[PDB]
Amino acid sequence: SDFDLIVVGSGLFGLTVAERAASQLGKKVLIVEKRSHLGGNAYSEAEPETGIEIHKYGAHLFHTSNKRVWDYVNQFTAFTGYQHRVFAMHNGTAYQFPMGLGLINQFFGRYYTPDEARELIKEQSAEIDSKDATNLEEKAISLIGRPLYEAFIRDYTAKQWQTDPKELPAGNITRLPVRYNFDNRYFNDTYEGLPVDGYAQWLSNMADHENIEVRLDTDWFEVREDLRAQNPEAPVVYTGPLDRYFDYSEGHLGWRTLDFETEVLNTGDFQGTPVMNYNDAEFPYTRIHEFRHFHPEREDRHPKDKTVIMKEYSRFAEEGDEPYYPINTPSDREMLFKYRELADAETESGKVYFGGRLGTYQYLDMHMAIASALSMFDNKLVDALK
């Protein structure tokens, strides 16, 4: 046949399943992608005026402690030694971030030793006991005290969720957000970096195999009857939206979306750092990304007098809006397992597998998407293709 496997969607999940089938099972894989480009939401492209690489669907920072995933992705791209660090803008001051000795010194006015800082946080947070916290506000205060909560958590959280924190579940904080040293590495994982030649080159290399065919600007639901007729035996891995597959027969799953406002400025350096969080309510956006600083190794290929920045705004997703984060209201949860059983019937009846961020109504870091694909490959698709 012209293909042994159809993959719907060319994001990291689809690309991983496709590449494994192609290179390990020697199968022909047809990938069907609705957008004009490969790579799903990890896709990046140059800004036309400056040439600076910008992430189209949000800043994407790669990090993992999963060695298998790390070894895998390094077949398709090399990574820079970039370490993500974040600063937090509060009342006209940039604070070291996340919360640790640096922030604590800046915000309480003098140096606290590790042991002194531990003691300080015990005092500040003594007010509410964690077991007795009823909502997000209280749970936070129970961990770090009112001053820290009100300066760095309250308004930021309110902006992201479009909701008063008093009206959010206590279960949404599970650990102490405070470091008792000066380590401001944003991520805790063994491996971290950015693709040396950008995300688009990386994702593209995954699809670059003699056994893989890619059809861009193609909606699965418009071509499916035709494609499966050509080889009825070929299984489908579907990574598009789960509810849309079943025609919203159980109603629409709820998502948060993001609006990005991208400006080219006539300065070489807007904030001297990749990501500045904006913690005060007076700013509509949650944070500003300055993309040249994601790739300092490319400095002499960047304009010296211009820079690209992007402000991020959070709101609930209406029809047509890009789906980014699942909301997971209890209504959403019940709607989900109704769809799960639809999906499982569809797999046994139609050899159609559901995966990925959209296919399973889930937030997945990139290494999680890849891990999950590697697993579906190993525990399902290997059998389904003999």
Ligand X SMILES: Cc1cc2c(cc1C)N(C[C@H](O)[C@H](O)[C@H](O)COP(=O)(O)OP(=O)(O)OC[C@H]1O[C@@H](n3cnc4c(N)ncnc43)[C@H](O)[C@@H]1O)c1[nH]c(=O)[nH]c(=O)c1N2
Ligand Y SMILES: O=c1ccn([C@@H]2O[C@H](COP(=O)(O)OP(=O)(O)O[C@H]3O[C@H](CO)[C@H](O)[C@H](O)[C@H]3O)[C@@H](O)[C@H]2O)c(=O)[nH]1
Q: Nearest to residue 263, comparing CAs of 285, 235, 282?
A: 285
Breaks (C-N over 2.5 A) in the chain follow: none
Q: How far apart are CA 5 and CA 231, in angstroms?
A: 9
Reading the block at residue 182, the tokens are 């000066």
Q: How far apart are CA 18 and CA 213, in angstroms?
A: 10
Q: Nearest to residue 195, comparing CAs of 371, 55, 290?
A: 55
If binding is defined by CB under 6 A, does position 279 make contact with ligand Y? yes
Active-site residue, from 256, 290, 292, 357: 256
Smaller CB distance to ligand X: residue 150 or 365? 365
261 strand-pairing partners: 311
Q: How far apart are CA 278 and CA 258, in angstroms?
A: 16
From ligand Y, ligand X, Na ion, none, interface partner of 125 (C-beta below 5 to 8 A by class): Na ion
Map residues 111-150 to x or -, x wherever contact with its own copies holds by CB under 8 A. x-xxx-----------------------------------
Reading the block at residue 328, the tokens are 């997971």
From candidates 88, 133, 227, 374, binder to ligand Y by CB under 6 A: 88
Q: How far is the CB of 57 from ligand Y (least distance, A)?
A: 10
Map residues 112-131 to x or -, x wherever contact with ligand Y holds by CB under 6 A. --------------------
User: Tokens 């005060």 map to which residue?
Assistant: 280
If binding is defined by CB under 5 A, does position 204 make contact with Na ion? no
If binding is defined by CB under 8 A, does position 263 make contact with its own copies? no
Smaller CB distance to its own copies: residue 110 or 131? 110
Stretch that binds ligand Y, among 119-127, 150-158, 266-274, 332-340 (CB under 6 A): 150-158
Triad 226, 230, 232: Cα angle to 5°: 100
Q: How far apart are CA 294 and CA 290, in angstroms?
A: 8
Contact status, residue 335 vs residue 251, Cβ threshold 8 Å: yes
From candidates 41, 50, 277, 307, binder to ligand Y by CB under 6 A: 277
Is 179 tagged catalytic? yes
Active-site residue, from 154, 312, 353, 357: 312
Smaller CB distance to ligand Y: residue 21 or 308? 308
If binding is defined by CB under 5 A, does position 124 make contact with Na ion? no
Smaller CB distance to Na ion: residue 149 or 191? 149
Half-sphere exposure of 65 (CA within 13 A, CB side): 4
Binding site for ligand X (CB under 6 A): 8-14, 32-35, 40-42, 58-62, 219-221, 239-240, 258, 324-325, 356-358, 364-367, 369
If binding is defined by CB under 6 A, does position 152 make contact with ligand Y? yes
If binding is defined by CB under 6 A, does position 157 make contact with ligand Y? yes
From its own copies, ligand X, ligand Y, none, interface partner of 357 (C-beta below 5 to 8 A by class): ligand X
Q: What burial class does residue 123 get, using C-beta atoms within 10 Å of its C-beta: 0-12 exposed, 13-18 middle, 19+ buried?
A: exposed
Q: How far is the CB of 91 from its own copies (least distance, A)?
A: 8
341-344: which pairs have CB atoms within 8 A and are 24 or more residues apart? Answer: 342/246, 342/249, 342/250, 343/242, 343/245, 343/246
Q: How many residues are listed for the chain in this entry? A: 386
Contact status, residue 303 vs residue 50, Cβ threshold 8 Å: yes
Smaller CB distance to its own copies: residue 100 or 165? 100
Smaller CB distance to ligand Y: residue 184 or 352? 184
Question: From the CB of residue 138, how many other CB atoms can be counted at a distance below 10 Å?
Answer: 20
Collect all residues with Cβ–Cβ distance below 8 Å to 92 and sequence separation of at least 6. none
From candidates 41, 96, 239, 372, binder to its own copies by CB under 8 A: 96
Q: How far is the CB of 331 from ligand Y (least distance, A)?
A: 21
Distance of CA 30 to the CA centre of its chain: 26
Is 256 tagged catalytic? yes
Active-site residue, from 110, 115, 175, 341: 175
Is 312 tagged catalytic? yes
Give residues in contact with Na ion (CB under 5 A).
125, 142
Query: Mind telling me the catalytic residues?
Result: 175, 179, 256, 287, 312, 363, 365
Give residues in contact with ligand Y (CB under 6 A).
58-59, 61, 88, 152-153, 156-157, 160, 277, 279, 365
